[PDB]
Design a protein around this ligand. Structure first.
Ligand code: CLA
Ligand code: CLA
Ligand code: CLA
Ligand code: CLA
Ligand code: CLA
Ligand code: CLA
Ligand code: CLA
Ligand SMILES: CCCCCCCCCCCCCCCCCC(=O)OC[C@H](CO[C@@H]1O[C@H](CO)[C@H](O)[C@H](O)[C@H]1O)OC(=O)CCCCCCCCCCCCCCCCC
Ligand SMILES: CC(=O)O[C@H]1CC(C)(C)C(=C=C/C(C)=C/C=C/C(C)=C/C=C/C=C(C)/C=C/C=C(C)/C=C/[C@@]23O[C@]2(C)C[C@@H](O)CC3(C)C)[C@](C)(O)C1
Ligand SMILES: CC1=C(C#C/C(C)=C/C=C/C(C)=C/C=C/C=C(C)/C=C/C=C(C)/C=C/[C@@]23O[C@]2(C)C[C@@H](O)CC3(C)C)C(C)(C)C[C@H](O)C1
Ligand code: SF4
Ligand code: SF4
Lengths: 86, 119, 663, 131, 79, 186
């Protein structure tokens, strides 16, 4: 599994949530921006690692950062279809 | 004759370039299916857990993984920090040093080293 | 859950990255593992030396080559391969006699110069070096046990005070101590090893090279010069005196640091703290980088001076030894040079602590403050050299294709000629003030022509670009404008995604991967320069200012004997050379697909193949793929495998050409 | 009261200012604070006040500035004399070439030139500290 | 031997071969004994490096450890 | 305190201290003062024995290797070592002499062994200080049990050693200049 971290610079775009193809991200209420909402990654075990969330993030440097961990890959982080690891 | 060393070659060359390599490949593919396979680079192996716990049992390396290890008298450090924060506390602020540090130590990263659950 | 097929590549990509080990918890374990690995590697080196000595002793003709070295050829080892013709006779054997290989290493001249005369001495030497390998392994075991015994002595260790935990940092003081290591290395391992080799020369090498003389009197220390006429090599007396001088100097220098007592010698930390350094000397990657950067000038000068001033008996009389040694050591030093930069980048990623934002105190800090200036000026000089070397070469090519050799731009190599003139005046003044003059220096100063100037500019271009790529990778390993968090990730990682413009080849490891191509190209240029000047100095001096000459009169022309090796007319003793030539071409081209074609295509291909396997009648009832799931190689693994194929092809394609052209 | 981001930043500043002073003291014990690491050796401070302390010159720390100046100039004269009388005037190469021996005095003296350079460096360092 | 390359043919360079054996079988066996010793010791070293240091030995192993008197001096001399 | 409080610096007119150190080396090198006193005592003892054995051979000469055991006290070193190969290097090609080899190198190796298991063993292993400078615990039972008696005996040893050093220098220089007998005069 990868590591998807959300930083304080988030401005509640919701673009990262919409771009995620495996429903890793979600919007949670907060009080650090005018949108009163920040992103969260409660399900990074389903994060394939496509980094579309990073493409969609418009902050100066990404408020959402995906750290690839190749020696950590699970069946969900690899998108295995022909083969089951469970 | 200049030959007569080929008596050694006719045994050694077939041996070390066919029998030994084949045995090595078979032993390697057998080793690949052990629970201990590549325990130093592959996460979540039993031997890695045992080695980490063995290190933690040593009296020198008990509090070795703690990034804050070193404070000889942590009570003195905490008291000094609390005193310094009291003189700089903004107006009627209700945050103390103790709970501030307690909540700054507790983060929410459930998916960190979750591979410590199989072996 | 379990792993996929990429586990093997992932594990083997960091199989020796002891910092990445999972059980390793402290610098004690890391340092002890590294020390034991050093012992094992020394054992491997000793076994390799004993191997060469044995094969020279058993499957070779040292006893006959020593008698008539100039026209004779040494034997590497016998050939025992059941694939050859069981009938007739191979081109590598004298009819019914066994099959042999000609040695191109140079050990024969080494042993002859060192004083070997008989096979029995070589056999005893092989036995002694195998003994030394045993000794090295036993020392590894000894040190593992001593450190484990210190660890066990921590069961009877307490300071009775909370400061007892300080002993955690001193457990590996045996390995991590620097002052003692520097003192004893520079003194013993350098100076006294040189002095012991002077003793060896005076006791054996000089006695076993001339008629019997006085009891090794101090007249054995001479100051003649170079190239003793009969053997076309340096005087053994000169070599002994050189080693004696170096030994004395390094023995005196070795008393510098505070090694065994606190009352003698200055500490390295205090030396650095009052200079333009004060780097983090506790980093193992930093030490490795700066000693690899030390073995690089040593190996490059070894390549240069084995050829320019041949130190071994009849080494210049071998047309293949001289080129093979130079090319080998040039490649070794290029690898070490790029290693130094790779480990500097790894040091910056892993083992460097930097101030907050502005404290310009560390040397790396000051370098990083203006890193953009460094990279911009390196790019400027690289662009200038490339533009003005390629353009002048193109001018010469075009004007010589147009039947106008006299329209070429030939800048006379005036600066190199001035340096050569000054050195020659100094050497001639040395020689003229001798009662035993008429000495020779072989190729210490060589004819320098406009072709030499252009090739030197090309070599400078290659070095500049290699340093540019490596230095940019090192300086931006911790963060660039494109990816301002690069020190949070590994030293090598795939990419940063297709967004933000696209981020292929963004890691510092990718900078190393790009720079290895330029290292190979610069080394190829240097080796081509040396080999072309070696084959025909006259034709190189005249027709080497236009690249078509390099293409035709060197590559196309000198490849005639190699391709003719095995054909539909018979075979030569170059058949292995031609077969390896073609095999290395195949290896070089095979790595193109690992570099050009990238993962996703192949991952889809592997999914299709896996579909087939899970669809084939018998396979599906034995193997569902859930155990060692076949997956396409990851991005970094793919780049590394393509780099390995490319490097192997480019490097190993050359020795067949060298052997075919010179022999 | 609610903890605004400015208040959190203020706590960051207070914590950092206090802890950076605390860790310098004798109560943090980090491996980077060992001898041979960043901090100076106990009794031998090298740089203070942005000036090379007297302990830099090692065993010469007790020497006076005048003594070091005299030694520096004397060693410069002797070493320069040795180098000039070995290289250009009175060459030894021809004499040693015919089986002779070097004028050992020249060889010993010529090594006093860099010694004189570092001696005058030490003289300046001593003068700065008032010794 | 069938030579290749221009220089070997145009200079007459030849590769002499000893008509004797080189090393007798006894000498090769003597070398192989020590090679086997190296091999056994190297397998043991590979095992020890693979398993690594065991810190928990002080709970089960006998003795009480030992720090050589020079190692203590090197500890307290600095770093 | 002068020179770390070492014996030897006190004047003889009493009520005064010669504390002779015009170069001030005691205050320049206080961490090597024990080594300085070790060197001073070693030089003094060697010079005492050297002066005694510079006078004695003028009367009695041990009958031995005639190559040595002959000549003036000056021509007794380079003669009793012979034309060694380079310096103190035994000729292994022709041991038993027959051309060139040493005759004192036995004294040299005995002195080396004694020195290493003497001064070197006193300083390197598990320790010399100001007070135990020349004290190798040799013949201390003969030393009287009184705080000032030991001090004055050590002072007498030191002053005899300094006198013997100066005396040996003068004696050997006069012998080289003139030859002659014990007076060492023109
Ligand atoms: C000379 C270099 C080289 C070689 C050998 C290959 C080989 C291959 N490519 Mg490839 N490729 C290359 C360069 C090369 N490529 C380059 C530069 C590119 C540009 C991007 C591509 C792009 C590319 C694509 C896009 C595709 C291929 C495909 C293929 C495969 C189809 C051919 C096949 O199965 O034959 C078999 C392979 C051989 C090498 C033939 C020789 C086999 C040897 C001689 C016999 C066995 C040796 C013997 C067992 C020795 C044992 C080993 C020893 C250790 C004991 C094959 C593995 C296609 C594929 O995989 O589809 C099936 C495919 O889709 N390639
Ligand atoms: C440290 C390395 C080393 C070693 C082990 C030896 C060993 C030897 N040397 Mg030797 N030597 C060396 C370095 C060394 N040498 C160097 C660097 C020089 C140049 C100054 C000499 C100059 C030298 C001379 C001039 C002679 C020896 C001799 C000898 C032999 C007896 C001397 C001795 O001390 O025996 C115990 C012995 C084989 C002597 C000998 O036996 O002649 C063959 C002799 O005459 N050596
Ligand atoms: C106004 C035009 C201009 C100017 C003044 C400079 C100035 C500079 N460039 Mg540069 N550059 C330019 C355009 C320009 N560049 C363009 C268009 C490119 C894209 C190819 C580059 C690519 C480039 C690289 C890759 C590098 C520089 C570098 C440098 C610096 C060293 C000098 C050098 O290498 O020149 C050589 C310049 C080139 C090789 C680029 C080609 C020159 C172009 C074609 C000139 C275009 C001028 C423009 C058409 C004028 C139109 C005027 C009209 C509209 C009125 C210097 C500050 C180097 C540096 O940073 O070192 C300090 C360096 O490594 N430049
Ligand atoms: C024929 C092959 C070839 C050629 C001509 C070049 C040319 C160049 N490479 Mg390049 N490179 C190549 C193959 C080649 N590369 C390969 C196979 C790799 C492996 C991926 C690289 C990897 C590589 C890196 C990593 C770097 C370069 C750089 C450069 C530039 C060096 C500066 C220079 O000489 O500019 C002169 C320009 C020319 C000679 C081109 C001709 C211009 C017209 C025709 C005149 C130049 C544009 C460096 C760079 O950007 O320098 C600023 C750099 O950082 N190259
Ligand atoms: C050429 C550069 C150089 C410089 C600037 C110094 C400078 C210094 N050395 Mg040094 N040293 C050098 C080369 C150098 N050394 C070499 C080549 C050796 C090997 C022989 C030594 C061996 C050495 C020892 C053994 C000691 C010094 C000491 C010292 C310090 C006292 C100076 C003194 O009393 O000397 C006159 C001083 C900082 C002393 C010191 O202060 O150590 C704490 C000390 O004990 N050095
Ligand atoms: C520094 C002391 C010293 C040194 C370097 C020498 C050196 C020499 N002596 Mg000499 N000698 C000495 C003291 C010394 N002597 C003393 C004190 C006496 C009076 C007994 C003599 C009486 C003497 C005679 C009669 C002759 C020499 C001769 C010689 C030469 C040949 C070596 C030999 O066999 O000596 C022999 C020396 C002795 C037998 C006396 C050894 C006494 C030693 C120094 C005392 C032991 C010191 C020991 C390490 C400390 C522990 C013991 C302690 C309790 C006393 C040589 C140049 C011979 C020669 O060729 O003369 C020209 C010769 O014929 N010596
Ligand atoms: C193998 C022979 C051997 C060895 C290993 C030693 C070893 C030693 N001697 Mg020594 N010594 C020896 C033979 C030997 N001695 C003999 C034969 C004599 C004559 C009887 C002496 C006379 C002697 C004196 C008088 C002194 C030593 C001192 C020393 C110590 C310091 C050495 C040093 O720094 O060198 C320095 C290296 C040099 C080349 C010296 C320079 C030459 C001078 C300036 C003249 C050391 C324990 C000194 C000591 O103990 O310090 C307290 C000391 O003062 N030795
Ligand atoms: C002639 C021969 C000369 C040619 C050899 C030149 C090769 C250059 C040497 C560079 C090696 C160091 C780089 C390296 O190991 O890492 C190159 C990469 C490093 O591996 C990367 O490491 C990163 C962490 O730093 C991340 O974990 C990445 O996921 C992981 O891929 O290694 C691999 O990808 C190896 C894959 C192929 C393994 C083949 C096994 C070899 C078996 C035959 C022996
Ligand atoms: C178990 C055991 O053993 O214990 C041991 C312990 C221990 C301590 C080792 C022992 C001892 C003591 C010993 C051995 C003491 C020996 C002392 C000697 C030989 C002193 C000689 C001094 C010579 C001088 C001053 C020369 C002075 C010469 C001078 C001033 C010459 C002056 C001239 O003007 C004169 C006279 C002539 C002129 O031409 C020039 C010169 C030469 C200068 C014991 C007793 O053994 C017991
Ligand atoms: C010659 C020879 C050899 C030799 C030799 C040897 C051993 C030579 C040795 C020479 C040696 C040992 C020479 C000592 C000199 C001591 C001096 C000058 C002391 C001056 C001391 C002075 C000037 C003191 C002055 C004072 O007292 C005054 C006036 C007032 C006092 O209040 C204070 C002071 C202290 C300041 C070989 C090489 C072995 C063999 C070769 O074949 C023959
Ligand atoms: S796209 Fe970036 S800024 Fe927008 S909500 Fe997601 S994480 Fe926050
Ligand atoms: S990397 Fe892809 S799967 Fe993972 S959180 Fe970002 S958008 Fe979702």
């Amino acid at each position: 599994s990868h590591a998807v971290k959300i930083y304080d610079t988030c401005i509640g775009c919701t673009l990262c949530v919409r771009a995620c193809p495996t429903d890793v991200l979600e919007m949670v209420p907060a009080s650090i921006n005018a949108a009163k909402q920040v992103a969260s990654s409660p399900r990074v075990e389903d994060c394939v690692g496509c980094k579309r969330c990073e493409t969609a993030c418009p902050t100066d440097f990404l408020s959402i950062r995906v750290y690839l961990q190749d020696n950590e890959e699970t069946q969900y982080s690899l998108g295995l279809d022909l083969v089951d690891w469970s | 004759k200049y030959g007569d060393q080929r008596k050694f070659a006719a045994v050694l060359v077939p041996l070390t370039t066919l029998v030994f390599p084949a045995v090595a490949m078979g032993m390697f593919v057998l080793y690949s299916f052990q629970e201990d396979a590549f325990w130093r680079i592959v996460p979540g192996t039993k031997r890695a857990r045992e080695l980490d716990e063995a290190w933690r049992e040593h009296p020198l390396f008990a509090n070795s993984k703690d990034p804050l290890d070193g404070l000889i008298n942590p009570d003195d450090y905490e008291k000094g920090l609390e005193e310094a924060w009291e003189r700089a506390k903004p107006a009627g602020s209700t945050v103390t040093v103790k709970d501030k540090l307690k909540q700054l130590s507790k983060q929410n990263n459930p998916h960190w080293e979750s591979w410590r659950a199989m072996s | 859950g379990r792993c996929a097929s990429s586990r093997y590549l992932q594990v083997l990509g960091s199989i020796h990255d002891i910092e990445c080990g999972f059980g390793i918890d402290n610098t004690l374990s890391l340092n002890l593992q590294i020390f034991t690995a050093h012992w094992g590697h020394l054992t491997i080196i000793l076994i390799w030396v004993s191997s060469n000595l044995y094969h020279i002793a058993s499957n070779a003709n040292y006893s006959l080559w020593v008698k008539n070295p100039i026209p004779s050829m040494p034997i590497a080892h016998n050939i025992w391969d059941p694939h050859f013709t069981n009938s007739t006779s191979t081109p590598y054997s004298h009819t019914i006699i066994t099959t042999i290989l000609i040695a191109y290493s140079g050990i024969y001249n080494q042993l002859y110069t060192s004083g070997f005369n008989t096979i029995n001495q070589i056999y005893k030497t092989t036995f002694t070096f195998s003994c030394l390998a045993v000794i090295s392994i036993l020392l590894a075991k000894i040190h593992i046990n001593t450190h484990s015994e210190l660890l066990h002595k921590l069961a009877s260790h307490t300071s009775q005070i909370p400061s007892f935990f300080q002993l955690l940092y001193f457990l590996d003081v045996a390995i991590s101590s620097v002052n003692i290591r520097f003192n004893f290395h520079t003194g013993i391992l350098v100076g006294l090893f040189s002095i012991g080799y002077t003793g060896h020369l005076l006791d054996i090498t000089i006695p076993a090279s001339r008629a019997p003389l006085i009891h090794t009197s101090p007249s054995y220390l001479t100051f003649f010069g170079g190239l003793k006429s009969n053997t076309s090599s340096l005087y053994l007396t000169d070599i002994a005196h050189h080693h004696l001088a170096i030994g004395i100097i390094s023995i005196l220098t070795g008393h510098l640091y505070s090694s065994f007592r606190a009352a003698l010698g200055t500490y390295i930390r205090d030396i650095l703290y009052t200079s333009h350094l004060t780097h983090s000397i506790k980093s193992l990657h930093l030490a490795l980088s700066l000693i690899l950067a030390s073995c690089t000038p040593l190996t490059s000068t070894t390549a240069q001076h084995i050829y320019s001033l041949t130190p071994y008996f009849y080494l210049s009389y071998d047309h293949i030894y001289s080129t093979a040694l130079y090319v080998h050591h040039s490649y070794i030093t290029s690898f070490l040079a790029i290693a130094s930069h790779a480990h500097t980048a790894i040091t910056l990623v892993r083992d460097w602590v930097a101030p907050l934002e502005q404290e310009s105190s560390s040397k790396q800090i000051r370098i990083h403050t203006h890193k953009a200036a460094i990279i911009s000026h390196l790019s400027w000089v690289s662009l200038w050299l490339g533009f003005h070397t390629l353009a002048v070469y193109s001018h010469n090519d075009t004007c010589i294709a147009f039947n106008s050799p006299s329209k070429q731009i030939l800048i006379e190599a005036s600066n190199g000629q001035l340096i050569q003139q000054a050195s020659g005046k100094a050497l001639y003044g040395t020689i003229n003030s001798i009662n035993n003059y008429n000495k020779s220096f072989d190729s210490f100063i060589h004819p320098i022509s406009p072709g030499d100037l252009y090739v030197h500019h090309a070599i400078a271009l290659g070095l500049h670009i290699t340093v540019l790529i490596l230095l940019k990778g090192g300086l931006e390993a911790r963060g660039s404008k494109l990816m301002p968090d690069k020190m949070e990730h590994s030293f090598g990682f795939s990419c940063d995604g297709p967004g933000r413009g696209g981020t292929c080849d963004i890691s510092a490891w990718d900078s190393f991967y790009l720079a290895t191509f330029w290292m190979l190209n610069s080394n190829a240029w240097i080796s081509f320069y040396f080999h072309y000047k070696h084959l025909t100095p006259r034709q190189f001096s005249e027709s080497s200012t236009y690249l078509e000459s390099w293409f035709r009169d060197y590559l196309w022309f000198n490849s005639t004997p190699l391709i003719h090796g095995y054909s539909t007319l018979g075979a030569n003793d170059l058949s292995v050379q031609s077969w390896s030539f073609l095999l290395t071409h195949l290896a070089w081209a095979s790595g193109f697909m690992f570099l050009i074609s990238w993962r996703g295509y192949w991952q889809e291909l592997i999914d299709i193949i896996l579909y087939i396997h899970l669809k084939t009648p018998i396979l599906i009832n034995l193997w569902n793929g859930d155990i060692y799931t076949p997956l396409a190689l990851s991005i970094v693994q793919a780049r590394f495998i393509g780099l390995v194929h490319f490097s192997t092809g480019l490097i190993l394609t050359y020795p067949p050409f060298i052997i075919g052209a010179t022999s | 009261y609610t903890e605004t981001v400015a208040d959190e930043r203020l706590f960051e500043q207070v914590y950092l200012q206090y802890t950076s002073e605390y860790l310098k003291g004798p109560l943090y014990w980090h491996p980077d604070k060992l001898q041979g690491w960043l901090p100076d050796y106990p009794g031998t401070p090298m740089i203070k006040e942005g000036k090379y302390t007297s302990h830099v010159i090692g065993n010469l720390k007790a020497f006076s500035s005048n003594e070091l100046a005299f030694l520096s100039m004397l060693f410069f004269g002797v070493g320069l004399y040795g180098n000039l009388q070995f290289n250009f005037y009175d060459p030894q190469w021809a004499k040693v070439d015919a089986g002779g021996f070097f004028n050992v005095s020249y060889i010993v003296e010529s090594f006093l030139l860099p010694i004189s350079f570092f001696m005058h460096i030490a003289c300046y360092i001593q003068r700065q500290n008032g010794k | 031997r069938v030579p290749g390359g221009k220089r070997t043919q145009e200079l007459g360079l030849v590769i002499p071969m000893a008509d004797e054996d080189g090393l007798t079988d006894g000498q090769v066996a003597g070398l192989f004994v020590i090679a086997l010793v190296v091999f056994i010791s190297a397998m043991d070293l590979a095992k020890t490096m693979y398993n690594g240091i065991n810190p928990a030995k002080f709970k089960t192993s006998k003795g009480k450890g030992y720090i050589s008197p020079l190692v203590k001096r090197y500890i307290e001399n600095g770093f | 305190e002068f020179a770390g409080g070492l014996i030897g610096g006190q004047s003889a007119f009493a009520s005064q201290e010669y504390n002779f150190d015009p170069l001030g080396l005691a205050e320049k090198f206080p961490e090597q003062l024990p080594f300085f006193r070790e060197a001073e005592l070693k030089h003094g003892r060697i010079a005492m024995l050297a002066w005694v054995g510079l006078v004695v051979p003028e009367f009695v000469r041990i009958p031995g290797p005639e190559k040595c055991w002959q000549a003036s006290a000056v021509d007794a070193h380079s003669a009793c070592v012979x034309x060694x190969x380079x310096x103190x290097x035994x000729x292994x090609x022709x041991x038993x002499x027959x051309x060139x080899x040493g005759a004192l190198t036995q004294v040299f190796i005995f002195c080396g062994t004694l020195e290493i298991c003497g001064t070197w063993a006193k300083m390197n292993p598990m320790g010399l200080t100001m007070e135990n400078a020349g004290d190798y615990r040799l013949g201390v039972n003969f030393l009287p049990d009184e705080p000032e008696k030991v001090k004055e005996m050590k002072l007498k040893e030191l002053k005899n050693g300094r006198l013997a050093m100066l005396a040996f220098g003068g004696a050997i220089t006069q012998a080289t200049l003139t030859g002659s007998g014990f007076p060492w005069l023109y």
